[PDB]
Amino acid sequence: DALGLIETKGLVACIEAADAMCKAANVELIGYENVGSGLVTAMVKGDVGAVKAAVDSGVESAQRIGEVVTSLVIARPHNDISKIVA
Amino acid sequence: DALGLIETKGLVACIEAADAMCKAANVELIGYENVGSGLVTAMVKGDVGAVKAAVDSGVESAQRIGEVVTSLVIARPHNDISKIVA
Amino acid sequence: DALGLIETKGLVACIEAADAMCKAANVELIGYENVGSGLVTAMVKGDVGAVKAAVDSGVESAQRIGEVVTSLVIARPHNDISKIVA
Amino acid sequence: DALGLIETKGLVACIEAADAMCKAANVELIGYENVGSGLVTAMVKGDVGAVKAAVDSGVESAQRIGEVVTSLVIARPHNDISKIVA
Amino acid sequence: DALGLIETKGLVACIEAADAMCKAANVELIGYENVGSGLVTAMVKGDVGAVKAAVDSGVESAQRIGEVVTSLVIARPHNDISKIVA
Amino acid sequence: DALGLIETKGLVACIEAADAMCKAANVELIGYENVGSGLVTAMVKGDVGAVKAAVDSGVESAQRIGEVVTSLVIARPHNDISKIVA
Numbered sequence: 001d002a003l004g005l006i007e008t009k010g011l012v013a014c015i016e017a018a019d020a021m022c023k024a025a026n027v028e029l030i031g032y033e034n035v036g037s038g039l040v041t042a043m044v045k046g047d048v049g050a051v052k053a054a055v056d057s058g059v060e061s062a063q064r065i066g067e068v069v070t071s072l073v074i075a076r077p078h079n080d081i082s083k084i085v086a
Numbered sequence: 087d088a089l090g091l092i093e094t095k096g097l098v099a100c101i102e103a104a105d106a107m108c109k110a111a112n113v114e115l116i117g118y119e120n121v122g123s124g125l126v127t128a129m130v131k132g133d134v135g136a137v138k139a140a141v142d143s144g145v146e147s148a149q150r151i152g153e154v155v156t157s158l159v160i161a162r163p164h165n166d167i168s169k170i171v172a
Numbered sequence: 173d174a175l176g177l178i179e180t181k182g183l184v185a186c187i188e189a190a191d192a193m194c195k196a197a198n199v200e201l202i203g204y205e206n207v208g209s210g211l212v213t214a215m216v217k218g219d220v221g222a223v224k225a226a227v228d229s230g231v232e233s234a235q236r237i238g239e240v241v242t243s244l245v246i247a248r249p250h251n252d253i254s255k256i257v258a
Numbered sequence: 259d260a261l262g263l264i265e266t267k268g269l270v271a272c273i274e275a276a277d278a279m280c281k282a283a284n285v286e287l288i289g290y291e292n293v294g295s296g297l298v299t300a301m302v303k304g305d306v307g308a309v310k311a312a313v314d315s316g317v318e319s320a321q322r323i324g325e326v327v328t329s330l331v332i333a334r335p336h337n338d339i340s341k342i343v344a
Numbered sequence: 345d346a347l348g349l350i351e352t353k354g355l356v357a358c359i360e361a362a363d364a365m366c367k368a369a370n371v372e373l374i375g376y377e378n379v380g381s382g383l384v385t386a387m388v389k390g391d392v393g394a395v396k397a398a399v400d401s402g403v404e405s406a407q408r409i410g411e412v413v414t415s416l417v418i419a420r421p422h423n424d425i426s427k428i429v430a
Numbered sequence: 431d432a433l434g435l436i437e438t439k440g441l442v443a444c445i446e447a448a449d450a451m452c453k454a455a456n457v458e459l460i461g462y463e464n465v466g467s468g469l470v471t472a473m474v475k476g477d478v479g480a481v482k483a484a485v486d487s488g489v490e491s492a493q494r495i496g497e498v499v500t501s502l503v504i505a506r507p508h509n510d511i512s513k514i515v516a
Binding site for chain 2: 009010011012013015016018019022023028029031032034036037038039040065066
């Protein structure tokens with residue numbers, strides 16, 4: 001299924017992204033990951049409409065308190081991707 | 087129960103955030119976490135009034151000596167969140 | 173076989189690079205790797221034409237949403253290299 | 259017992275902080291910790307007067323050769339804190 | 345035997361350094377190592393003429409695509425060094 | 431015995447520091463350590479005159495090719511220190 005990602009400067013603004021994502025639509029939180037430099041990513045999985053909706057709300061609410069760096073929906077990640085994230 | 091987060095540049099200013107949080111109201115300290123770039127987060131759990139009060143005081147005193155980057159209260163984190171933090 | 177690499181600032185823009193690479197031609201995703209400072213690299217392996225094509229498309233689409241820092245095709249990495257990456 | 263912390267840019271200036279702290283008064287060195295971005299913290303434990311004295315001297319001498327970012331004395335850390343550091 | 349080192353911003357430009365080093369003369373690739381901040385180092389071992397030649401070529405080609413930060417040849421590293429790198 | 435430290439931006443300039451230290455006087459290389467942000471430290475142990483001499487030469491030669499951030503000789507580190515480094 002689809003993949004929603006919000007990447008932030010700082011963990012707290014990511015936790016908010018994550019929280020607001022899971023509340024806003026039927027997505028399961030996969031995890032987070034940071035790549036140094038303050039960059040932290042929250043990743044969720046769901047149907048594409050559900051994921052699209054989480055990321056919209058995730059970004060709205062994380063931006064409210066912090067910096068959203070990038071957000072993305074991949075409606076059907078190559079299988080190779082889906083292996084690597086989960 | 088609710089979740090209080092204070093993210094700082096540097097560990098020392100975080101340790102102060104944490105200390106002042108636990109003193110200021112009935113919250114238990116979950117842990118800290120850094121995501122590189124000097125960004126360190128202190129996280130506590132309690133009732134929402136108790137958590138709201140810790141963060142107010144946590145931020146007051148960490149700022150006294152260092153840089154508070156983000157603070158947040160989530161009164162009821164999606165269950166998925168509560169799994170990830172603890 | 174050949175080696176395609178796209179290095180980005182931030183994980184999300186890398187995940188897109190990776191996704192678009194594997195879709196665009198017959199390459200298998202080896203992995204990713206970050207070296208701090210927000211720098212994350214996606215690496216794939218395939219025939220040189222297939223790899224060249226992934227990287228072209230990987231870069232097109234990662235840039236769409238984020239910053240592509242370096243991209244490279246090594247058509248035949250020294251064997252020592254191929255040992256290190258995989 | 260009390261807690262003394264000196265956070266520096268760079269390890270060497272921290273090692274000096276630490277050395278000068280333990281020489282200057284009756285404190286035991288707990289450890290150090292870095293949170294990326296060059297930020298390294300030296301932490302000691304002792305009575306509040308002993309700890310206050312180490313940090314004064316720790317800071318004097320680390321600054322001599324490097325950058326002291328934060329210093330702090332917590333005379334009685336919440337028990338939760340004392341669990342986290344040690 | 346001697347030691348050749350090329351340090352880069354970013355992994356990809358390092359992988360090129362490495363590849364071009366091993367192709368250009370009779371050296372075996374020891375490994376790479378990053379120290380955060382985007383800084384990644386490729387290290388090879390060989391006779392001093394062979395190593396000198398790799399680094400010349402390693403630097404030429406890594407610079408072609410990325411940033412070479414430092415390069416070095418140590419014709420006979422103190423034994424202590426040779427222990428630490430390998 | 432005494433402690434000599436040279437901290438550099440980048441590993442390569444550190445390796446040179448280290449090499450030139452061990453050549454220049456009777457010191458044993460303890461190790462290196464990085465604290466992110468490109469900051470890498472080389473640490474040696476010897477008599478104070480031997481250590482003083484290494485660091486002088488270590489710094490001369492590392493600076494030749496890179497950036498020496500801090501250098502230090504501690505002629506007799508508090509015992510607590512000597513425990514932590516080794």
